[PDB]
């Protein structure tokens, strides 16, 4: 048409561009794009429908389509003039796109148009939204972005699991092919901020106003001041983008000679460990207009909210520096004139450089606690060992403490043939039966411990959305508000069992008892006081487990040093005991399932939700994949009870000790030393409680992400819409805590999303109609959160949902639920897998079975576990309890028979029959505690 063709060649300006319409005449083009909105009635970060634009794609010499677009738009005459005024002040910056203002008549009237030349198809908001809301069911935009910039080919996606981080670790390489674009965009944003400051222009910078070449447009919400006094607002631009900077490794060019990827690496000297000026240079180069103080060394931070802020920047900047400069800092001291080599400080990836306060170079004969501290340090062990190059693993290798490598194996189990024969003689283990054996003792070969250790390759450096985390931390703290803690003295500490290992090297000379006897109460107090001014690094040892299981992978635990454990108990036990003594809360550590406990827990979690459904989910590789920023945060929440007993400096040094002891320390695997990249160490003194804090944190962040990614123009209830508007302000517009809104959001969560938590196991009761409308979290929100904040893919085949509350959760702590009738009232009881019970009967470690008459209490305990199976509709399940009763009777008869034949001792059957009658076992599940 004459109109359409004249419009086309007028859009073609004085440039030489061969344009082709995008399926339109003179009319607009409608798309579906991600926006960051805040306009006094709607707020959030979500996908809306874009309506008023005409798009023309550009061709090249060979008549092929290229990634360049002219995007024209019609609007009102007052916006035209304002945007033209603002542009002429900014037109000379190289980071601004080229604009063209003209007037064209679509009818008898003339309307104004603004054309932007040579944009890309997507913006910086589309990429961030794609990576923070991942769903492999529909990921068209991410795939298009990856192929249009030569990160991969289009047939790369025909592989299945191409996105999984654990299967197919190669996807990381693909994502690292975007880093340079992100770095270029950052540099252009700094240029644009400088230009805005000089011109005298005030406005907020959003991700959807920058394209993937780094240019800026859309000056409609800006205003003008006097030159030299412009102020750009950059709070939600940087915070929403932070998680993507570590996933693409955007700062990899900084380790080359001139920040050029075609040149060799920088060669630092090996003795350098400071890098404090490099960190300030990096901050001033990429984050110039972020207006909050940054401390390269977190020992200068003001409160614990400050530490999180600065450690987040440290996590990113530490990826540029050599890995041999991190860890303990040592020097030479003299005792009686002989020289040692001892640790006097530490260089943390997240916290910077820390120096010990009480170090003395010249001293006479040293004392008992000084000997303990010097034997615990890895300095003298590593200094006098051999150099090691271990090619079996990709972790960092330090030294070999001896001249041979050790290869430890795992043995098979012992067969209890009598119980198996008795079971076979009663009709068990037939063909086609629904009960069969699938729990065994699996054996392992020589190179099994090192293979298991190499699973720390799944721990990656992760940067968080800092403004989002600072709100979630305040909400998580409301859950831990009915307890009390603080420090205790050495004579108030409770230790369950003193005949367990003390770790390396203390396990050369005795158990833990030996060390709690030799140290007096005033020696332990002095050691505790020493760790509030100094850092003591220790060595953790790796142990292979020998137990029954259903899958054939070796399991390992961490044995931590006695020096760490002794002081952590004095710091944390008062709080840990207080959580375990409480009933009716969210964390249910300490509650027993017997005497009506299971029923009480279920009734408490049902609470009064309105359209209730039940839900449970899964954490892949939970302890090997936990980011370091969330373990730090978990430690800071437990230490908030120390407001009167400890100073700010004391609290900082306790945090530093914890990090150097159980977060990234030396591990002894075999007889060699390795460096741990991160993750949790299952075996430290606060494991289950820290896991609880972490679990609650992830749930809260999934709810926050659910609510803000919802189109607020479609929320019918005006109360829930006002709540969405206030969440955005408290994240990205407010700098201090707002205690009235933290209470309000916390109550809202306790009415519609009710949790039961036990040290990363969980059950949730949630309002089903709110979740369908996006007002409450679902399984898809958890999957998205774990992808960008945990570096794993969660398959929804390990998650369950239940729509009927008369059936209790599908699984909790390996138990099932059933609603039975017990004396006029219905109650919920737990029961196990029958395979687990029968396997415990059949396979054991010698002596412990294969002769039942030596230990009949084992079978009484197993029968207590198996009792509730008598209530099951399936008949093969109740036979398990009856089989155990009959075998107990048989063992008692056989034992009393032996004593009379070969010896003449005659035993009596007084109050023993109670063990093969069901009344003893029924009373364990009835609501009245005994003993």
């Amino acid at each position: 048409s004459a109109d359409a063709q004249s419009f086309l060649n007028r859009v073609c300006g004085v440039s030489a561009a061969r344009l082709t319409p995008c399926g339109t005449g003179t009319s607009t083009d409608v798309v579906y794009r991600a926006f960051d909105i805040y306009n006094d009635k709607v707020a959030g970060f979500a996908k809306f429908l874009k309506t008023n634009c005409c798009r023309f794609q550009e061709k090249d010499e060979d008549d092929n389509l290229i990634d360049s677009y002219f995007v024209v738009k019609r609007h009102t005459f007052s916006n035209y003039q304002h945007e033209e005024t603002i542009y002429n002040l900014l037109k000379d910056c190289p980071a601004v796109a080229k604009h063209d203002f003209f007037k064209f008549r679509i009818d008898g009237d003339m309307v104004p148009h603004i054309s932007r030349q040579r944009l890309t198809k997507y913006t910086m908001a589309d990429l961030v939204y794609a990576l923070r809301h991942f769903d492999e069911g529909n990921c068209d935009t991410l795939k298009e972005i990856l192929v249009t910039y030569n990160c991969c080919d289009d047939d790369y996606f025909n592989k299945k699991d191409w996105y999984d981080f654990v299967e197919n670790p190669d996807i990381l390489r693909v994502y690292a092919n975007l880093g340079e674009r992100v770095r270029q965009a950052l540099l252009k944003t700094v240029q644009f901020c400088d230009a805005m400051r000089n011109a005298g222009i005030v406005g907020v910078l959003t991700l959807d106003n920058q394209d993937l070449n780094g240019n800026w447009y859309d000056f409609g919400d800006f205003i003008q001041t006097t030159p030299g006094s412009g102020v750009p607002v950059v709070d939600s631009y940087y915070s929403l983008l932070m998680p993507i900077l570590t996933l693409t490794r955007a700062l990899t060019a900084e380790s080359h000679v001139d920040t050029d990827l075609t040149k060799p690496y920088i060669k630092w000297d090996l003795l350098k460990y400071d890098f404090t000026e490099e960190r300030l240079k990096l901050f001033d180069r990429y984050f110039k207009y972020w207006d909050q103080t940054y401390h390269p060394n977190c020992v200068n931070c003001l409160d614990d909210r400050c530490i999180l802020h600065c450690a987040n920047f440290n996590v990113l900047f530490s990826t540029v520096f050599p890995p041999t400069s991190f860890g303990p800092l040592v020097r030479k001291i003299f005792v009686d004139g002989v020289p040692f080599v001892v640790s006097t400080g530490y260089h943390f990836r997240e916290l910077g450089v820390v120096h010990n306060q009480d170090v003395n170079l010249h001293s006479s004969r040293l004392s008992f606690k000084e000997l303990l501290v010097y034997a615990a340090d890895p300095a003298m062990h590593a200094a006098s060992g051999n150099l090691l190059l271990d090619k079996r693993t990709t972790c960092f290798s330090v030294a070999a403490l001896t001249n041979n490598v050790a290869f430890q194996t795992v043995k098979p189990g012992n067969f209890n043939k009598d119980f198996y024969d008795f079971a076979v003689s009663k009709g068990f283990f037939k063909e086609g039966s629904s009960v069969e054996l699938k729990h065994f003792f699996f054996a392992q070969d020589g190179n099994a411990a090192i293979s298991d250790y190499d699973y720390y390759r799944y721990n990656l450096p992760t940067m968080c959305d800092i403004r989002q985390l600072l709100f979630v931390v305040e909400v998580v703290d409301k859950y831990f508000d009915c307890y009390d803690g603080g420090c205790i003295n050495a004579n108030q500490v409770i230790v369950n069992n003193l005949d367990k290992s003390a770790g390396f090297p203390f396990n050369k000379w005795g158990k833990a008892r030996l060390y709690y006897d030799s140290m007096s109460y005033e020696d332990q107090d002095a050691l505790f006081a020493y760790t509030k001014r100094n850092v003591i690094p220790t060595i953790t040892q790796m142990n292979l487990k020998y137990a029954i299981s259903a899958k054939n992978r070796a399991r390992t635990v961490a044995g931590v040093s006695i020096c760490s454990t002794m002081t952590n108990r004095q710091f944390h036990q008062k709080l840990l005991k207080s959580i375990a003594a409480t009933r009716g809360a969210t964390v249910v550590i300490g509650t027993s399932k017997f005497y009506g406990g299971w029923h009480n827990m279920l009734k408490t979690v049902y609470s009064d939700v309105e359209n209730p459904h039940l839900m449970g989910w899964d954490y892949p590789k939970c302890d090997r994949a936990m980011p370091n920023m969330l373990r730090i945060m978990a430690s800071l929440v437990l230490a908030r009870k120390h407001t009167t007993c400890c100073s700010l400096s004391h609290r900082f040094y306790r945090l530093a000790n914890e990090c150097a002891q159980v977060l990234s320390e030396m591990v002894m695997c075999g007889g060699s030393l390795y460096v741990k990249p991160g993750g949790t160490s299952s075996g430290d003194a606060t494991t289950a409680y820290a896991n609880s804090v972490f679990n609650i944190c992830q749930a809260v962040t999934a709810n926050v992400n659910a609510l803000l990614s919802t189109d607020g123009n479609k929320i019918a209830d005006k109360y829930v819409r006002n709540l969405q508007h206030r969440l955005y302000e408290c994240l990205y517009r407010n700098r201090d805590v707002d205690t009235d809104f933290v209470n309000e959001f916390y109550a809202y969560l306790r009415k519609h999303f009710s949790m039961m938590i036990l040290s990363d196991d969980a059950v949730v009761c949630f309002n089903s109609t709110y979740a369908s409308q996006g007002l409450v979290a679902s399984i898809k929100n958890f999957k998205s959160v774990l992808y960008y904040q945990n570096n794993v893919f969660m398959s929804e085949a390990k998650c369950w949902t239940e729509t009927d509350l008369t059936k209790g959760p599908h699984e909790f702590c390996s138990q099932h639920t059933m609603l039975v009738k017990q004396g006029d009232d219905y109650v919920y009881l737990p029961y196990p897998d029958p395979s687990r019970i029968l396997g415990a009967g059949c396979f054991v470690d010698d002596i412990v079975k294969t002769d039942g008459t030596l230990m009949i209490e084992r079978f009484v305990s197993l029968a207590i576990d198996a009792y509730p199976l008598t209530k099951h509709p399936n008949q093969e399940y109740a036979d398990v309890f009856h089989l155990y009763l009959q075998y107990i009777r048989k063992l008692h008869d056989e034992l009393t028979g032996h004593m009379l034949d070969m010896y003449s001792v005659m035993l009596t059957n007084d109050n023993t029959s109670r063990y093969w009658e069901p009344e003893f076992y029924e009373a364990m599940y009835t609501p009245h505690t005994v003993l």
Partner: peptide
């Protein structure tokens, strides 16, 4: 749409 001072 992202404004400085909506009210």
């Amino acid at each position: 749409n992202n404004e400085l001072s909506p009210v």
